[PDB]
């Protein structure tokens with residue numbers, strides 16, 4: 001089972017803008033999560049070939065990872081903060097759906113999600 005193409009990070013047909021919230025998501029939120037000790041398995045798409053997980057993309061049909069999110073933020077792919085927040089939430093949810101409660105990868109996702117939620121509670125009001 002080969003890997004799918006990664007999620008899109010550039011598309012001239014999709015509208016986009018910069019907002020103060022999206023700039024916070026890159027400079028504060030992504031930056032903090034990216035340097036966490038447990039970030040590395042989330043820094044690129046799940047490579048189901050390398051991991052010998054041929055079922056992964058039979059079960060997870062909306063893949064997401066922080067490397068994709070980072071590129072989307074650096075490329076100003078998004079129209080609003082909610083789109084980007086949804087990508088982080090999809091990344092976490094996928095991990096919790098695919099893996100067993102208590103698996104190491106789930107504990108690593110949960111630590112990142114705890115930091116994410118702190119930072120999202122501090123999301124600035126739109127200017």
Ligand SMILES: CCS(=O)(=O)Nc1ccc(Oc2ccc(Cl)cc2)c(-c2cn(C)c(=O)c3ccccc23)c1
Pocket residue numbers: 040041042043044045046047048050051053094095098099104105
């Ligand atoms: C960089 C993406 S990669 O695919 O190229 N490499 C890579 C390497 C290891 C991975 O898993 C572990 C990592 C650390 C521990 Cl302690 C335990 C498992 C994963 C991985 C990530 N996710 C989000 C999963 O849901 C997942 C589910 C099952 C197996 C592996 C993974 C990906």
